[PDB]
């Protein structure tokens, strides 16, 4: 019900407007009167177009690169809003982002406010800067602040695709009235028009997408190949890709040419590439590198004093006991020497301090974690990527175009640089097709991540003229599904043609052979399953035995057993249940694999590669083959060379048996007497008879024929799959889930059958920072009534601590008493959710709460100093602090809830819980505000 018109513009800038279909497109109108705002600089073409949209009272989405100058459009709209005397609210995604914008907005326009969970300043300001999440609550409350608002600005709107907080952006947009106009600031996204159509469709008014690829300060990208003499220019200042350099850089990796980050950093200071941001994906790596830089000093003594006055000055607020912390103390020398680190783990008082320092020029090198790019933008002249590849947590991969685009977009300073330099350090061979995508590829599409939450549902039930269902229908998620339907149909037809084009396997009976081979593979896996049952395999797990390890698609080939142990489950989210059998096996792993400490990161060597032997413990079921061969193993495997020796031994047996290294028969040798395996063996034997009967096997060009059959089979699966996707075309995707949630809500007593919110439901609305359903139910079980004040807050740490820590600390009964108590309560909810047809598993829900910092929080609550609590746990300081900050956040969500159900005692226990918790460095605010 929306059409798009394209409008002509000049300097490589695009203007399109999506309008409601029943309204005639009319060209924008030239300004009558003076400009609302005037700028120091001559505006860019993209800025002017957008400004004209605001002058003309229509919404615009501006999508341009970071530092292009998207921010001026918003400023002009505020200026217009203020000029007409109506209000405006500018929202930012993160608290950090908002503060920076608060200040930035404060300079230009006098009447400004900041609304964050933590701070509230000038709430009835003409221009109010708030975090978008706060805005959503404001919409739910039905508050007065929205009353004179004519324009809302969403800055960095492209973080809407983020999974956890993405929904709030969408939800906020839905809640806002049709009368309001928007300015959207975002980075360059491919589907910018699509977003604009949704706004028009939702708000029944025009939204303009103004898109430009302009970069005010151009960038020249380089790739340094490890072991290479120098950096190569892969992409130019003009955005072009130089393959010759890529290939040339790549060959050096082949070592057919004819890699410290220390070295890269040294040249940058030497060649006046000066401030540089070095990116590492590990917190530990960022720190490791930083130390290495300490050998060289990048600061003058005048600057050295400057670093210390500001540092010390920031730190003055901090309690002297907090000021004496090791975390604080050891950082200062680095700063003094021009080195900085910025990562998630570090303390916030220091984090901000380094950011301040970098802006002053005191910090020449910054080694920061990947989330620095997702931060208040501080640009640098050069950006260094220590690695081109990333670990997903499952598999290794290269960085995505969007990932590159964000990090490499930190390079180039508008006032200050003629060029921006981006450096990619690359340890693995990269293809031209793969490389071209990384550097010259597009950003991620802003695809929504709407999801249903109980708070969303409850609050919608609570509000008067809206329902939960209305939110779904009007969502972006739905819009995209509807809009993407034409493609699914097209894919089916095109796929259908493909099946026909390739439907020339020469004799149609090959499908039958393929099915026989497929059956064998299925059965073959069935045999293996019996062989790795612990009873049968433990007897053969002898050091030096040759074994094959395959783990869900990455198969390691041959390994040698080094040791075996039986371990018990210490999960302990769920019950202990069964004990796990772990075998430690020396496998041939990737060069990339060895670099990651984690057990999960092990991966098989690549085809090009030599490989390296590592002993990695694997579970019993991952061994696909066991062999007769046992080999000699040196007794210290620690050295590469000694571990390397097994690889040669393995090949010596491989060379010796080229018909395959021998395997133990399950019955003849393993002895597994399970009757069912014999049947599998018989069935495998039978198909082998069938397999040899077939003509195809003997025939020449069998492989060519079979491959077509595999190809043909693939399209059918895709055709079927697409057809399934098409079947859901006229359906609202998440509505079924809402109803399932709705049933759960009714059963649990939160709301009635006729969708009227109930008193239990009302309490739950307040809790938006955690699992509200459990907490109110826990409140209604009176669990909180008898708790220690410290226990009450410590128990809640599990509600908001999400980070992955290795393990919990055993707890005194006061802390773990409630821990026992919550899990049953959690277990009960889980029982009902399953009953209501939802997808969850009881072990998982129960183990989604982490008690790892339970002790620590209690200890902090009672009056312990921050320094003391750090000793207790291995999670980093920043992580600890973050959890506490959310803890205060949750307590306030909890405090309010108590008022709704009128327990004064509960309000005070929780409200005094904050006071024990909220003190000193943990709650400082130095990011200047």
């Amino acid at each position: 019900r929306v059409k798009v018109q394209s409008v002509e513009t000049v300097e490589g800038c695009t203007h399109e407007v999506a309008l409601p279909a029943e309204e005639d497109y009319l060209p924008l109108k030239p300004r009558v009167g003076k400009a609302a705002k005037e700028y120091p600089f001559i505006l860019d073409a993209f800025q002017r177009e957008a400004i004209q949209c605001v002058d003309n009272n229509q919404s615009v989405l501006v999508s341009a690169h970071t530092s292009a100058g998207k921010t001026v459009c918003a400023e002009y709209a505020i200026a217009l809003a203020l000029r007409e005397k109506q209000r405006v609210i500018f929202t930012s995604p993160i608290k950090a982002l908002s503060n920076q914008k608060y200040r930035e907005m404060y300079e230009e326009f006098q009447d400004v406010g900041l609304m964050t969970g933590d701070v509230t300043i000038n709430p009835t300001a003409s221009c109010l800067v708030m975090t978008t999440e706060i805005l959503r609550s404001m919409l739910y409350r039905g508050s007065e602040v929205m009353r004179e608002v004519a324009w809302v600005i969403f800055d960095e709107i492209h973080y809407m695709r983020d999974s956890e907080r993405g929904v709030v952006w969408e939800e906020t947009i839905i809640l806002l009235p049709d009368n309001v106009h928007y300015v959207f600031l975002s980075a360059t996204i491919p589907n910018a028009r699509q977003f604009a159509e949704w706004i028009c469709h939702l708000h029944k008014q025009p939204c303009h997408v103004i898109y430009t690829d302009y970069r005010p300060t151009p960038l020249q990208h380089y790739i340094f190949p490890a072991g290479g003499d120098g950096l190569h220019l892969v992409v130019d200042e003009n955005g072009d890709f130089r393959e010759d350099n890529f290939n040339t850089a790549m060959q050096v990796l082949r070592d057919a040419g004819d890699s410290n980050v220390f070295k890269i950093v040294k040249m940058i200071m030497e060649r006046n590439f000066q401030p540089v941001i070095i990116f590492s994906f590990s917190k530990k790596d960022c720190e490791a590198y930083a130390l290495q830089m300490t050998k060289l000093d990048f600061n003058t003594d005048e600057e050295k004093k400057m670093v210390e006055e500001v540092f010390s000055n920031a730190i003055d607020c901090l309690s002297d006991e907090d000021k004496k912390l090791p975390q604080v103390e050891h950082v200062l020398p680095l700063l003094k020497r021009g080195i900085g680190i910025h990562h998630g783990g570090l303390l916030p008082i220091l984090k901000e301090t380094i950011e301040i320092l970098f802006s002053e020029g005191l910090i020449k090198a910054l080694f920061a974690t990947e989330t620095f790019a997702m931060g208040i933008n501080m640009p640098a002249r050069t950006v260094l990527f220590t690695n081109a590849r990333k670990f997903d947590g499952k598999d290794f991969r290269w960085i995505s175009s969007g990932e590159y685009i964000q990090m490499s977009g930190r390079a180039g300073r508008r006032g200050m640089d003629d060029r921006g330099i981006v450096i990619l350090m690359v340890d693995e061979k990269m293809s031209p097709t793969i490389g071209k995508q990384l550097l010259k590829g597009s950003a991620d599409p802003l695809n929504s991540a709407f999801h249903l939450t109980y708070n969303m549902v409850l609050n919608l039930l609570r509000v008067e003229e809206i329902n939960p269902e209305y939110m779904l229908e009007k969502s972006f998620y739905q819009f995209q599904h509807y809009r993407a339907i034409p493609g699914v149909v097209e894919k089916v037809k095109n796929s259908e043609e493909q099946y026909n084009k390739i439907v020339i396997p020469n004799e149609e009976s090959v499908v039958i052979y393929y099915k026989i081979r497929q059956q064998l593979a299925k059965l073959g896996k069935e045999i293996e399953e019996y062989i790795h049952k612990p009873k049968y395999c433990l007897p053969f797990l002898q050091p030096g035995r040759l074994v094959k390890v395959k783990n869900e698609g990455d198969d390691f080939g041959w390994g040698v057993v080094v040791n075996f142990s039986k371990k018990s489950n210490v999960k302990p989210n769920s019950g202990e249940l069964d004990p796990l059998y772990v075998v430690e096996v020396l496998l041939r792993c990737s060069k990339e694999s060895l670099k990651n400490s984690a057990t999960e990161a092990a991966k098989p060597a690549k085809p090009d590669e030599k490989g390296e032997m590592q002993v990695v413990p694997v579970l019993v079921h991952l061994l696909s083959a066991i062999s007769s061969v046992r080999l000699y193993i040196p007794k210290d495997l620690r050295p590469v060379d000694n571990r390397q020796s097994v690889l040669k031994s393995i090949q010596e047996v491989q060379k010796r048996f080229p018909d395959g290294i021998p395997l133990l028969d399950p019955i003849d040798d393993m002895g597994i007497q399970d009757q069912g395996l014999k049947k599998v063996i018989q069935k495998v034997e039978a198909f082998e008879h069938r397999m040899y009967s077939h003509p195809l096997h003997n025939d020449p060009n069998l492989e060519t024929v079979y491959t077509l059959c595999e190809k043909k089979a693939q399209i059918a699966i895709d055709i079927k799959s697409a057809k399934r996707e098409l079947k859901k075309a006229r359906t609202v995707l998440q509505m079924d889930e809402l109803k399932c949630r709705k049933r759960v809500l009714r059963r649990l007593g939160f709301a009635t059958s006729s969708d009227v919110i109930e008193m239990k439901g009302r309490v739950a609305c307040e809790i938006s920072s955690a699992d509200e359903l459990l907490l109110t139910e826990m409140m209604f079980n009176g669990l909180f009534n008898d708790l220690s004040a410290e226990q009450a807050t410590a128990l809640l740490s599990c509600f908001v601590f999400q980070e992955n820590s290795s393990e919990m600390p055993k707890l005194t009964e006061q802390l773990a008493g409630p821990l026992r108590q919550m899990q049953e309560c959690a277990k009960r909810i889980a029982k009902v959710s399953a009953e209501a047809k939802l997808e969850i598993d009881e072990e998982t829900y129960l183990s989604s709460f982490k008690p790892h910092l339970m002790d620590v929080v209690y200890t902090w609550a009672t009056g312990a100093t921050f320094a003391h609590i750090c000793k207790m746990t291995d999670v980093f300081e920043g992580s600890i602090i973050r959890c506490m900050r959310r803890l205060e956040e949750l307590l306030r969500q909890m405090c309010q809830a108590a008022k709704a159900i009128g327990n004064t005692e509960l309000e005070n226990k929780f409200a005094e819980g904050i006071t024990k918790i909220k003190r000193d460095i943990v709650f400082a605010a130095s990011l200047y505000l």
Partner: protein, 85 residues
């Protein structure tokens, strides 16, 4: 190197742990288990190096060289920028 032994050692199963083996000294990869799938399971085999760690802290007390302070503003898109070893 190699030999073929087809002979089972029942102790491992009966006693729950390895018997009849000479164990090497080795460092394993990490603290988990490869197979473990949902991480609905955790096991314990049962040493940080942070910035404020003592080994690290004495490196800063020990001084370092300063290479270049204040020639010109910067330098185009040159295809190869070298950097010595």
């Amino acid at each position: 190197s190699f030999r073929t032994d087809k002979k089972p050692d029942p102790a491992n199963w009966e006693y729950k742990s390895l018997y009849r083996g000479d164990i090497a000294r080795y460092k394993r990869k990490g603290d988990s288990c490869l197979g473990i799938n949902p991480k609905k399971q955790c096991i314990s085999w049962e040493t940080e190096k942070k910035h404020s760690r003592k080994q690290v802290e004495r490196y800063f007390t020990k001084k370092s060289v300063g290479l270049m302070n204040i020639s010109k503003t910067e330098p185009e898109p040159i295809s190869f920028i070298p950097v010595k070893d």
